[PDB]
Structure formats: C-alpha cells, structure tokens
Amino acid sequence: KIHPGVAMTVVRTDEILSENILFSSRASTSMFIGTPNVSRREARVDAVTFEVHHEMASIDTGLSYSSTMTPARVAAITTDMGIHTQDFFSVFPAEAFGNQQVNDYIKAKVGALCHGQQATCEIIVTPVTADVAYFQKSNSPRGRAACVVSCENYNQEVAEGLIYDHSRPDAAYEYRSTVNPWASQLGSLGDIMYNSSYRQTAVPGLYSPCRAFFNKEELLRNNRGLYNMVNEYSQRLGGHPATSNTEVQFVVIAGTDVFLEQPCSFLQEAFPALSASSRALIDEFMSVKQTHAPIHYGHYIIEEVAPVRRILKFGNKVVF
Amino acid sequence: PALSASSRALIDEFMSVKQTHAPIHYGHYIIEEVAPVRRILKFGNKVVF
Amino acid sequence: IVTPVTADVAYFQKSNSPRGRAACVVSCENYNQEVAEGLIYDHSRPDAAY
Amino acid sequence: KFEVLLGVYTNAIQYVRFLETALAVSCVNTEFKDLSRMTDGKIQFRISVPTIAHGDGRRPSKQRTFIVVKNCHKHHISTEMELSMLDLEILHSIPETPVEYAEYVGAVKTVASALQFGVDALERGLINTVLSVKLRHAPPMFILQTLADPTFTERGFSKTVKSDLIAMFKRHLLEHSFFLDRAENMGSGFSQYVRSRLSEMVAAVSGESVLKGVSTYTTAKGGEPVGGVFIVTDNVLRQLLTFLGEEADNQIMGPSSYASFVVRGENLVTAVSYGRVMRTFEHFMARIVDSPEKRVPISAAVIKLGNHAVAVESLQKMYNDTQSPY
Amino acid sequence: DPTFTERGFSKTVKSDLIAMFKRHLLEHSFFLDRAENMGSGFSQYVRSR
Amino acid sequence: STKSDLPAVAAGVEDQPRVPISAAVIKLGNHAVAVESLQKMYNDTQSPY
Amino acid sequence: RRRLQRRIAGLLPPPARRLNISRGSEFTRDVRGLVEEHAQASSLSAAAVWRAGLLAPSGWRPPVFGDFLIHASSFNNAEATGTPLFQFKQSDPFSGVDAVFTPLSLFILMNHGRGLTRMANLLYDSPATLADLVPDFGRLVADRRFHNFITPVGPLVENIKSTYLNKITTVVHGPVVSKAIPRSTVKVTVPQEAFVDLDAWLSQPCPADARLYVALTYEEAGPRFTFFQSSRGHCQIMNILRIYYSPSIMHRYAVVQPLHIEELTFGAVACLGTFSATDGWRRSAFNYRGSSLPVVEIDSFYSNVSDWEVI
Amino acid sequence: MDLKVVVSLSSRLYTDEIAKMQQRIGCILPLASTHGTQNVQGLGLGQVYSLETVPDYVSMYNYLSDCTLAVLDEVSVDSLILTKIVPGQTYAIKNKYQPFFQWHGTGSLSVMPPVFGREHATVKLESNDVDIVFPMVLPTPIAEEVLQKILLFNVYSRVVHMHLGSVSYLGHHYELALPEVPGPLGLALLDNLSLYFCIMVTLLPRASMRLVRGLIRHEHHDLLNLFQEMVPDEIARIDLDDLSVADDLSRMRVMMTYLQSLASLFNLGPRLATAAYSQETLTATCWLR
Amino acid sequence: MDLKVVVSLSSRLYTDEIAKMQQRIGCILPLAQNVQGLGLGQVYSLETVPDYVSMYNYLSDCTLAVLDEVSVDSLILTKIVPGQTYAIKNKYQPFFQWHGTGSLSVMPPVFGREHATVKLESNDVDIVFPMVLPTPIAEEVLQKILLFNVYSRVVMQAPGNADMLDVHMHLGSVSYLGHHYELALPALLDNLSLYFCIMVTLLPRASMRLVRGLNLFQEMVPDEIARIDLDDLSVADDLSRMRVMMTYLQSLASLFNLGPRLATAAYSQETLTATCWLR
Amino acid sequence: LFHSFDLLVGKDAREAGI
Amino acid sequence: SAAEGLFHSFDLLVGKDAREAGI
C-alpha cells in the first residue's frame, strides 16, 4: 500500500437505460407509401420461404430541426459503475518481456459473472502533481480539452494545433499547457495506449472507453461544422459504441438493434465520479452535504457531477 | 445488518444527531439498521426513525 | 459465524450474505453445476460486489 | 373416468393502422409518388426568405432566396412468412368430403393467417421505420434549448460563439437532463415545471418549414389544429396525465385527412380478410372445375401547451405485441 | 414494468432484477405504516400505492 | 371474431338472474375495485385468518 | 373416376405463355395476358400464394431414397422417424443383408465390452446378435479402420413392417421428406447425450445453412459417436474440431512409439447434411414404454453425406 | 427463386462514389447474412479487414468460406443491390480487378482477401463512415503461391526476400502487402503445419532417399535442380537401412490420409468452377463448385 | 432446363465404331462443340508424354459429361452440374464393383492406355475414358503404383536393396471388400514419383525451420536420426527450397484428393447402374 | 400540366405552387 | 446534372409528327 511514482486517471463508461420522450411537429415529413409486393426466396420442398417486401420514400420537409427527443427519466443503471479494470494481457497478447520465467510470474501476480456489466475501466498514467481542481468538473482525461468544434471546419492543420500543440495554452486553463504531459502530446504514453496508430496488434473485440478521447480520427471528426456535428450525432454514427447486455463491454459490430447515443463522444468531456482518498471523507460527505471538506491535509474527495443525480444511501444517511 | 454498536457511547450520540453522527470512531464503530421494517427506537425521549 | 478480525466494517453495513462471497443464485447461470458452484465456492474468481 | 377439455381460446390480432395511430400527424401521406419513380432522390426547393431593408448605408440590403435540395429517404421493409407446401397441396385440391373440407378450411385459415400476418407485419414495419426516421432527424433537447434560440446564433458562427455554445451545451446536459426525475424531487413545482419543459420543446421545434398547406389533423372538442405529437413510453404516459391532470379533448382527434385511404388502404386488408381468401380460392376451384371438361375519431389524448394543442401517444402497446425492444 | 422485459431475460438482467427486488423490499415494503408518517398526504399516497 | 366468440366464452354467465350482494366499493379511477374482509367469517370458526 | 380427373386437373403444370410476334393484334392480348398473370402473381392476395404451388417445373427437387433389406431383429420398430442410420460395409459379394445401426443399437455396439445406456439396452436388450452382426469389432477399432467401414445413409423416412427380412427406406441425398403419398415432413431425431451444439462450446456471420456433422472417434475407453452441429464449412469445421481436440493431441503426445500407427490417428468426421440455420434445432423427447430421453429434433433437412475425413 | 437483397445506404451516395461503385459492377462481395434486406454496416469484408488492426487474411479466408457470397449488379442513389450466390446457379462475373490476373486458363478461380494492398480495392463511402473492401478473385495456381507466400513470410521473418514478397505470375509481377506478424489464426495455421511436420517427419519412407541419391548421381532431371548437386548426410543416415514393403505400405496409407488432411487444410476460401469464359466480354459464366 | 450437349461429328462412323461405343455407353466422358479435344485422349496421344500431373490438373480443370445415346453422326451427352443427379455405369475393361460404396473417384487411368480407350480408326482422334472407381480402391492403386514407380527406379539404379518380384508380390493386387483386383504393371508416372521423392526428402529441413519458427515439446517427437542436422545454410537456396517445397506439397496434396469426387446411393448389380450426384 | 402535383405542394398559389 | 431535383411536365418535339427521337 505504498505510493508509486505516478498517479492514474481511471476512466470508465457508465451505461444507463433512459425512457425517452420524442417530439415532432405536424407535417414534418412527406411520405410516399409504396404498395407491398411479395416475392418467394427459397422454394423449399417442405416449406417455401416467402418474403413480403415494401418500399417507402420519406422526404424531410422542415429545413430546420422539426423533431427532438429528450432523455426523460432513468430506468436502471445497467452497468456496474464498478472497479473491474481492463487487462492488457488480453488486449495485446503478442507482446511479453525478455525472460519467460519473469513473464509467467508477472502473469501469475496479476489476472491473466453474478452482476450486470462490469464496466471495464481504462487507466491513464499522469504525474502526481495534477491539481484536483481540474478533476472536479466536466473535463477531458488528457490535458487539453477538445474545443475543436470551436475551430474552423474541414481544416485539419489548424485543428491539429489546438489538440496536440502545447506551444499555445489550453482553451479552459489559459495559464498552463496541460494537466499531464504523459498523455496529451502527440506521441505520449497515453497516446500510444488508445490511439489508432499504435493499437495495430490489439484484439478488436474488446472495448476501451478511452478510444473516444484518444482516437485521432474521431477527435478530428468533430472538426467539421456544428450543423454537421449535431447532424452526425443523431444519425446513428456509432463511432464509439459499447454492447447492450453482456458481462464485459464489447464494441458492437455495427449493431443496429440497440438504441444509443454518446454525448461523451459528442462534446468530448468526461464527468468526475464520486471518489475520495479515505473512508473518512466518504463518511464526512454523507453526514454534511453543504459543509463537507473537499480538501483535507493530504487527502481529497471529488463530489460527483453527472447527468443523472445518483442518490446514495449509506445506512440511513442519504444524500441526493 | 442490524443496529449494532461497538460501545454505548456511539449509540448514545447517534440518538441525538441522527444525521451528522460519526459512523466509525477510532476503534469503535456503529452500524445503522437498514431493515425493511423501520423500527421506532426510543431512548429517553430522543426518538429516532 | 467465525470470521477473521480484518473484515471491513463497510461490508457489514450493507445488505449482504453473512459469508464472504454473495451467493449468486440466479445471477450465475441457469441449470449447471460448473458455473454456479464455480461462482459460489471457487474463490479464484472475485465475487460479485467487491 | 374421463378427462375434460374446458375450452381452447385464442387471441385476436389488433389491426394497427398508421393512419389510425397518432404518429401520422408528423407525416403527411400525399398522392404524388413521383419521387419513388424518380431516379434521383433529391427535390429542389425555390424558397424565399425575407430580410430587413437596412436603413443605414452599411451594405445594400439585397434580396435573399435559397435554392435548397432535399434528398429523400427510400426505405425497404421485408419480412418472411414460411408456409408449408403440404397445405398448398390441399389448397390446389378440391374437397368433397367433410374431413377434407374441414382440412381445406383449416388450411385456408392458415393462409388467411399468413397474408394477415404479412399485412400486420408491414403495418408495424411502416410505423417502425417512421419512428426510426424520427430518431434519425432528432438531435436531443439539450441542444435545441440553445441552438434553436437565436440569441446565440445568427451573429455569425465565429470561434467564440461555438466555444460558448459548447459550454452551454455542457450546462443543459447537467442541470436539465432527466427532467421528469427533477419534477419528482421538486415539491409543489409538479405541474408547471413539466409544462415549461414541454412548451420549451414546442418552441424549439415549431419554426420555419417549407411545403405547407391546410390545417391538417383537427381535434373534436375545440377544433383546433394539432401542433405536434409526443411519442412516449407507458410509464411516462401514465405519469404525464397526472402532472398535467386534464386533457383538452376526450382522446379524440377528428382528421378529415383520412379520406383518401379509406378506399385505398382498406381494400388491401379487406382482400385478405378471409371473406376474400375463401372467395378467390372458390374462384380458383371453379377454374379447376372448368379445366378438364373443355372523419373517423382517432384514439389520441390532446394536451394544451399555451396556444398549441399537441397530442400525446404511447406505442409501447404496439411494440409489446411483438415482444421486441422499444 | 414492461421496460425491464423489453430485452430478453438474459444472464445480466437476472442480476439487476434481483437488485431491484432488494431495493423495492428496503423502500416500499410495509406501504401502510409509512403512510402514517405524513398526515396530510395519506389519501393520495395510498391511492398511488 | 371476438363478438362472435362472445356467446361461446360466456357459457352460462350471461344467462343468469342477478341479485345484489354486499361489499364496499373503492373507485381507483377507471377501475372500481371491491374491498371486503373475511375475518368476520374466520372468527366464527376460532381459526386464524 | 371423376375424382381422379378433378384431382389430376389440380396437379398439372400451367401452359407456357405465348408471344405472337407475327400477328399484330394477337400481341396485344398476349401482353394483356402477361400483365394479368403478373399482377395476380405479384400483388398481396391469395392469387399470389396460388402461384407458389405450381412450382414451375432449380427450385424444387425430388429426393432419392435408399432401399435396404435388414433383419427385423437388428431393428426396433418403436423408434421415431428421422433416425440417422449407419450402414456397414459388407465384404461378401452377394449378401443382400446390410448392417444398419440406429444410434441406440450403435450405443450398445459401442459400450458392450466397455439415459442413452438405459434407452439403448431397453430397445435393444440383446447384444449377441448385434455384436455377431459385425464380423469384428475389437481389432477393427484397434487398427483404427472402423471408420471407412461405417457409412451414413441419412435418416429413416418410411419403414415397412416385417416379421423377418425388414426393409428400411432412407433419404441418402437431398431434402428429407416422407414417402407416403399423403405428405408429411420427417423430423430428424438425434439423441441429445451424443449431441452437442458447437456454438455452446465456443461461447457471427449469419450463415445460409448450418450443417450437421458426425465425428466417430477412437477414444481410449472405446468408440464414441458425436453428432456435431455447426455454423461453418467442412474445411472450417475440421479446424474447429482441431481446436476442440485439445486432450487428443496430448494423448497423441502420450504414445512415444511412432511405428504403431494406430494411436497417431484420432477418428474421422463426416458432414451428413444441411438444415435450416434460421429455423434452428429443437429439443424433443422420444418416448419408450420404460423411459423418455431428450432427443434433438431438426426439421427441414437437406442431406448430402460427405466422406470420412480423418482428423 | 428471386434471390435479390437490397443493401440500402444510410445516407446519400456522392457522385464520385457513384462512379467508383459503378466502375466495379459484377465483382465478388461477401455478405454477413442471407436475409431479405441487409445494411451497408455489415456488408463486405470491412468488418474483419479494418485499418485499425493487423491484416490477418487467414481469418478472412475462414470468414469467406463461412459467409455467403454475392456479386454486385445495381448501384443507384441511396441504395445498392446485391445478388446472392447459391449452389446450382450460374452467374456472370466480370474481371474488373486492379491486380490484373487474366483467367486465360479458365480453371477454378479463388476468392481471396485483398492481400495486394488495401488502396486499390478500398472503395469508399462517405455517406456513412464505412470502408467496403472487395475480395480479390484469382485462379488456383496463383492462389496456391499467394497462400504459400503468406505462410512463408512468417517463417522467414527471422532469416533476396523481394522474391518471397512479390508474386510470380507469367504476365506481370504485382507487389502484395505483407504484415510482419501474421496474427492469431495465421500463427495457429502455421502451428498446425508445424505439428503436422514434427509428427510426420518420422512417417516418411526410405526408398525415396535411395531414389534421390541415384537420380542426382546418375540421371539429372530438370526437377533435381533445387539441390545444385548437393546431398546432406541425413539422406545417407536414413539410407543406412534395408527397404521393406508392408510397413512402407502402411506408412503410405497413413501418408495418403495425412496429405488429404494437408490438402483440406490448405484449401481455404470458396472455389468456383468456370464454364465458357469469354475474354472479349471479360466475364465468365460460373457456378459455385 | 436443357442440358443435352451434342458433339459435332464431321465423320460418319462404321458399324464397329457403333459396337465399341455401345459397349461403354453408361460411362462418363470429360469435355473441353469441337470433336478433337472432347475427351482425355489428347493426353494419351503420341503428341505428349503420358504424364500424370498435367493429366490430373486437366481432369480437375475440365468438366465431365455422361452420355446416354450414341448415333452414327451425333454424340449425345449430358454434362455434369452440382445441381441434379445422373445414372452412371462402371463399364471399364478394368472392372471394379460398386457394392454399396457411396464414394467414387475419377482418376486418370493408370491401368494402361489400351485398357481404357475407344480407338476410332475412321475418325481423326483416339478417345479414352477416365477411370471411375471407388475411393479406397483409388487410394490403394495410388499407393501401389507410386511405390511401384519408386521401387522400380531403385532397382534400375541398384537392385541390391529392393527386389522387383517381392514388391510385385504385395503391390501386384489390391483387395477391398472381398473383390481381389489385379494391377497390370509393366516412363509413365515418373513426374509424380519424382515430386513425392523430392518432397519427402525436403521435409526434414522444412520441419526443422518450422520448429525453430516457434519448444522441446514438439522437438521430442521427431526421431533421433531425423533430428540431427547441421544448421548452416544460406538464405537464398533455403528460401527457394521452402518455396518449391510448399509448392509441390500443395500439388501433391491436391493430387491425393481425387478430383471431382462422385457419390452414389443405390448400385444395381443387375443393371450395373447407380444414381450418381456430384460431390 | 401532365402530372398530379396538387396535394403535395398545397392549394395556394401565392405561397406555393410550381 | 441540372435535372438533379426538378420535375418535368412535357417535352418539345421538333416537328416530328410520328417520331419519338431527335432533339
């Protein structure tokens, strides 16, 4: 239980099944209903396989947005919101150390189905002197926030500077360049972990949440205009998905049956979950919500901010 | 879990301030009951729920 | 039930099973003896909550 | 010592209709259909936007017309209905004895419950694809709380207004997501809060739209036009008739738009309504004999949001007949 | 509640359904004695339950 | 159809004379449930309800 | 006779359409009859499914059948229909009788010398005539040549009853249909205790037809028959069973002696047919008067037996 | 049997993409399903061949031999139509492929993943962010050499090699893309070949060594040019014995069944039988063998 | 559908040609319509050496066809497809019995040219038919002809290790399901024996490169005489050796699969005819 | 004008039409 | 093209009283 030289920014994703409300104005679209037509497909000698085929053409009349959808209420947090980490010995099984006797020993000391999904969390190495004030609001897990929709559309070179050039300071924190250097520059340790150009030897089936904050193509997909980047959000892009109901979060192979949308890929920010540094600040948070200490002498506690106000109950001390 | 206590001290202050009390002291501890029946607890007249 | 002295008090404030592994009865599987008993008695895999 | 058979029962199939459900307020069913026949899926609009004549000599206040081309969404829906050939063999045979006449009537009912399966498949397929269009063109409410308000835009999309619009998206995603959760946590702000959020949705959606016409989908009680429709799940439907309490009409819309499909959409399910399956197979058996010798009420609740009388409707009941995801 | 039966009864639905069972037991068991905790909102609370 | 199945499902229930019986009726909105208690029957028998 | 004429009018292929290019006015009624035939062979009415029954005689094929003559003593008439039969290669020139094996009789051929055992020994209580029915069993599984003398002939579809000299009719190649002129569909009955679904063992491309594989192997207890079901190809399923046979390569490592070429060979697999991958396998229960065992029921089978490809 | 799937696009096709698709009509495309309407997301070889990971063509061989096969007939705006390939049906397939391998022999062709580079068959849709890759169609004698070059770069990564990388065809020489590490299933296939070789190295006869000795010393064929007049001492030390007939026949029986196993191990990807290949129309009437 | 293919006979036959065709009507015949390259007879001519590998590669390339009627001016035959079935007959002068064997091989006839031919004297060509035979008989005659080639070459070079009569004792006759057939063995088939020879003498270095590719587990199972080798070789000759190694191994392995493998269901020994479908 | 463009665009000539 | 979004009502045939071709 001795501190290493580095710290972490543990990042996971949290699914939530949300009962939604869809609204659309009258005469939003015009529709041509084609007559249904039948066609045999497989003339089996036992039982012929039919097909009843249909065509319909729907044109969007309203030049503005004539339909919107709100996430009305939460039903059930389908994921764990847990502690189960990713295992890079499963992600990159091709690389190992020099001696085999130390390789199997390392695989022995680490890891080589009665709850929901287990919310496989990524780990980003950071220096220890990152201030906690960055870590208390909607931020990005690396240093520089992605105000790339703010830039000019269809221009990769100026957009590359506001994401990887640290000669200019950040969009939010104008007095520092990055909260961490080991994840924010172009070829950093955090950049060789979850980007496209160095995950060539990765197993494609598993899912990592940090791909939405390190894959360079989808950072630069938001380079385009806001009338395109809110069009592409509700266009079922599914550039950063995860599975609906399994044990471990897998990236779905273009699954169209599950309905989902990711604002953590849209505006490229992560929300701080409920953490602490001891049980003492945890019990101090539930006792006094308004007068809690967010900072103790060496310790700290980051109160959670989220789209869903997840209610906590510890015994009978209940906060909202 | 039922309404335990590691000492009478932690159960004699829990009845006073049922919200901002200490759930864990230095060596002692108190565990509130979370049962499906909310039992009326009466100690003197300091009635908690 | 005899337990060691280093059991955490955060376990005994939540509605759990009195032993260590929360016995996933339906949460394991349906009708086998290698997955249910594996998730209930084999501690090589960590339990459901912690 | 007998065994009794107390009865054998079957469920009726509820004939949904797209022009009966309230989702057809959002889509007009026109009688042109050249665009499906047209190769290119686009259509070119000559719209005309007004502008204010400037009073100063900053720039000449020119005319403005936009030539916008709108590409159509051509969708293909296709089910299957496996039907066994040993029913086809007694379809083709003529029956003469009451055992084979009973088997023939049973196989005709099997076929008449396959064509009706096809009609009830494409009718739910049509409404499913309509719903999947309106989830493909609906950015969420936490964007249109700001972007549909001209206080931020229409000064020029610079770096700065986008840099503040992103940070204002971040606020409505926090303080205003899951709005029906906060209404429960709030006390006597039950009714007017959800009325506020619904009327903000109506103000954020209902704006400039080309290709307009007559007041379609009038109700029955007041006779006003229905502005929009609220597709929801059953839990929020059961809640939002209590946070609102009262509805404008008695769940009746009175649309005379459903007049060109009472002849065109009814004779497609009437031809498979088992009066015509048996009739056509009797006609085919007569040919085999010939061979060897040689307006309305619409069930939809109407709520009132200021001036616009939108409708609420839950299709969960329709998706629950299929036991599929909503 | 049909939304929890929208998907099939998979392996992972049978975990949070148990969690929802235990939550409903801890909160909404004995719906009548906790109706007496308020005096004004009795009738609407019992009509809701 | 359903209406043509109505004399088939109603085997003899429609063709019965109807007498008024005693019960207390709650109206839970559109349903009108009938509350009743049988403990006055079970206390003629000295047997637990 | 009039019933026979009115029935033979129904089973009658339609006349082909005509085009009179020579005359002009006849081309009008030719294309009018063409659009009249198309519009009531396309639109949603009963006239659409009416045209699906004429079958247009690449779509439908009559299957072949395997007519064999066995003894009634090696056969149990109480079995269900789609039972995968295993003909044995006979060495005599003019024999006439062939050793067929239902999987219950195959099970008591397997275990004698070493529930499926209960049902197998309840339908086929005598092991003398059936171990006598083969010429040799222990040496033929010792030399590992028992696979080439076992050939599958597909499921039974119609068994004519007989006191002696029993005759079985089985679909060897093609779509499995019953033989009676009143039509029925034969469900292939395969017992579950020798069956497995390989996707339940693997734990994504939606195929056309999922095949049914039989893999006789030479286990150290004795012969073991397994009815494999997979989503894949023949050259694929041999690789999948190469991954599955993980203790088999350990056993092959176990035998130090290479000159004894018996223990280097571990069974052979055979593709029996192709069923509907969408309309998947059902579990059913074939009953006897003593017990009832779970039996995997497959419908709509298209059989084409493959050779014994050696693992 | 109207076998006609309509792969509808999510978004409108642009004009340069329309010309790119309409240039390639009649080429082999793999489907994920066989059902009556599919989507572009799930179409083609792009789900298993991505720009993200290593090109592992052996799992693509196995996906191709597993999944159904199709050829492209119609590309319009917002939609493209595919026609499935079933056994018993003869299809017209045009040689519109950028590695120009002429099917002048009219033998059995082979569907192959695009080992020859993604960029010539990476045919792009920016309607939806999807990268359909067309699998390459080539005859069997070039298929066996590209498969042996795939299996040989993995074993000759440790120890000129341009002859190993590039293909040897009689008309032209095209350079193919070679990954350094093959992947999981390519290494699994090479490991299966390694265990086959380590087991059957002792199941070889001994008169063939006397044959190669007497034929290199006595009558030099054209086929004995690979040794360049060189014999190891392993040939003599398995020629120190006397030759027999019964154990050699039994070793040969298990040798024929093991080389049948080798044949069906190397037979990857579907094989289509050509019939009356037309060079002038550049199409070939073929059924799936 | 139509499937009746006519071969354009320019020359009218004589009566003995009709007799020699009506003897072998039920057998199969390959294809390329023209009449010169209509069969496998163009390999068995005096134009090319009777080589095996190119004959098998042509036979796997070329389609097959069964013929039902023979006239004097038209050769009527139906070609083979994987769709439907045909009735074929074993009418080969090397006779083999199909007593319930569900598998059939179409191998090139190594029973001699005269044993499988129809010699057309008036016509331009000398046609042959390929051997249709059950697959265990096929692999057995492959073994007993291949080892006869190898064991005959070894006694042409030095008969001090093998004997012609002793290998002819065991390799003179095959025996399968009681029917005891004879192998008329008398160059022919030298390409295949040389291919197999150089391949099995090239496999040791291939297996050692394979075991050094990826340890002592799979290195134990080779024998101590096939394990010891000197590992000193340049990259060029060894690269060429492994390339031609897996080349001729693919040729050999696809050769030991016997082409388009026919399958039969019910063989009538009375009529010598069985239902046959392509497999 | 050879077509059926009446109910798609509407009734009025000042707002809409062809 | 310029016919990318427009309907067309009729044509103008250049003096061809029985021909459907031409400009």
Numbering used by the authors:
A (entry chain S): 1037 to 1148, 1174 to 1381
B (entry chain T): 1333 to 1381
C (entry chain T): 1185 to 1234
D (entry chain S): 51 to 344, 364 to 395
E (entry chain T): 199 to 247
F (entry chain T): 347 to 395
G (entry chain 5): 9 to 65, 83 to 139, 150 to 238, 256 to 363
H (entry chain 6): 1 to 159, 172 to 301
Give the original sentences from the paper that presented this experimental model.
Epstein-Bar virus (EBV), a member of the subfamily gammaherpesviruses that also includes the Kaposi Sarcoma-associated herpesvirus (KSHV),2,3 is the first identified oncovirus. Similar to other members of the family herpesviridae, EBV has a characteristic three-layer configuration: the outer lipid bilayer envelope containing viral glycoproteins responsible for host recognizing and membrane fusion, the inner pseudo-icosahedral nucleocapsid enclosing a 172-kb double-strand DNA (dsDNA) genome and the middle pleomorphic tegument compartment fulfilled with 20–40 different viral proteins. All herpesvirus capsid shell consists of 4 abundant proteins: the major capsid proteins (MCP) constituting the basic capsid skeleton through forming 150 hexons and 11 pentons, the small capsid proteins (SCP) binding to the tops of hexon MCPs or both hexon and penton MCPs, and the Tri1 and Tri2 forming the heterotrimeric triplexes to plug the large holes on the capsid floor.
We obtained an icosahedral reconstruction at a resolution of 4.1 Å from 32,721 particles, which, complemented by a 3.5 Å structure of the penton-vertex region through sub-particle classification and refinement, allowed us to build an ab initio atomic model for the viral capsid, including 16 copies of MCPs, 16 copies of SCPs, 5 copies of the triplex monomer proteins (Tri1) and 10 copies of triplex dimer proteins (Tri2). The type 1 interaction is an intracapsomer β-augmentation between two neighboring MCPs within a hexon or penton capsomer. The type 2 interaction is an intercapsomer and quasiequivalent interaction between two pairs of α-helices from the dimerization domains of MCPs across local 2-fold axes. The triplexes, heterotrimers of one Tri1 molecule and two Tri2 conformers (Tri2A and Tri2B), plug the large holes on the capsid floor. The triplex is then anchored to the capsid by the N-anchor of Tri1 that traverses the capsid floor, extends along the capsid inner surface and folds into a tripod of helices. There are five types of triplexes, Ta to Te, located at local 3-fold axes. The triplexes Tb to Te adopt a similar structure, whereas the Ta has a unique conformation with its N-anchor rotated ~120° counterclockwise compared to the others.
